[PDB]
Design a protein around this ligand. Structure first.
Ligand SMILES: *[C@@H]1O[C@H](CO[C@@H]2O[C@@H](C)[C@@H](O)[C@@H](O)[C@@H]2O)[C@@H](O[C@@H]2O[C@H](CO)[C@@H](O)[C@H](O)[C@H]2NC(C)=O)[C@H](O)[C@H]1NC(C)=O
Length: 207
């Protein structure tokens, strides 16, 4: 009774920022004549079998540095690499363990959902919006490029109040004065560097 292959540990779920090299580790004992492969769990396509990488994906590699551990390696990690990967032993039936990769992604500003340069007549309201994406979800701050204070609603009231900056995707300017013209900068960050900014130029005329 020299027994069947068995998984020794488990593949821990991992988190990497984009651009790094993701490594998943799979440990098996008593492999014998059987084979260890990796598959992408989404589409069941074979990434590797034994020491051969079967996919044509140039970013995928496998390692086997000691006798009980098999590693899958994904270089230049992308959002599309997110998800679960399966270590499989070709027993009958197959034995499988699953490990999943959470890819942290630095923020993007979705330009086509965000404000372009605009002009308004003095007195109009204008909302400046930066819709940002990323993982974790970014936060957005607004400030004037020239460092001058921004006029926003005084909370609960109908009056306005000066602030150094505003935290939120939509900067809501009310009854604009001509001196509120100029460049507004929205900065999106989620602590996965770099942050990202969009410059929005506001013109205020007579109207
Ligand atoms: C390991 O991760 C899978 C995948 O879930 C994703 O990755 C996690 C690390 C985390 O970021 C989740 O928010 C992601 O959805 C886990 O399976 C998921 O479990 C949740 C809650 O039980 C469920 O809503 C999802 O549908 C599951 N997704 C899949 C693809 O199965 C799994 O539970 C994690 N394992 C351990 C031991 O923590």
């Amino acid at each position: 009774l020299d027994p069947d292959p068995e998984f020794i540990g488990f593949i821990n779920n991992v988190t990497y920022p984009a651009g790094r090299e993701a490594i998943l580790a799979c440990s098996v004992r008593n492999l014998g004549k059987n084979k260890v492969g990796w598959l992408r769990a989404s589409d069941q396509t074979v990434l590797a079998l034994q020491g051969r990488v079967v996919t044509h994906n140039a970013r995928i590699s496998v390692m086997h540095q000691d006798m009980h551990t098999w590693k899958l390696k994904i270089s230049k990690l992308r959002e599309s690499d997110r998800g679960c990967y399966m270590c499989q032993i070709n027993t009958s039936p197959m034995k499988k363990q699953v490990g999943c990769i959470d890819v942290q992604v630095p923020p993007d500003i979705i330009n086509e959902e965000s404000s372009a340069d605009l002009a308004v007549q003095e007195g109009e309201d204008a909302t400046l919006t930066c819709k940002a994406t990323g993982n974790p979800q970014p936060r957005v701050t607004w400030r004037r490029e020239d460092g001058e204070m921004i006029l926003i609603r005084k909370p609960g009231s109908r009056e306005l109040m000066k602030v150094e900056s505003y935290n939120g995707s939509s900067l809501r300017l009310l009854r604009l004065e001509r001196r509120q013209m100029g460049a507004y900068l929205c900065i999106a960050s989620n602590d996965v560097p770099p942050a990202v900014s969009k410059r929005v130029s506001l013109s205020v005329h007579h109207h």
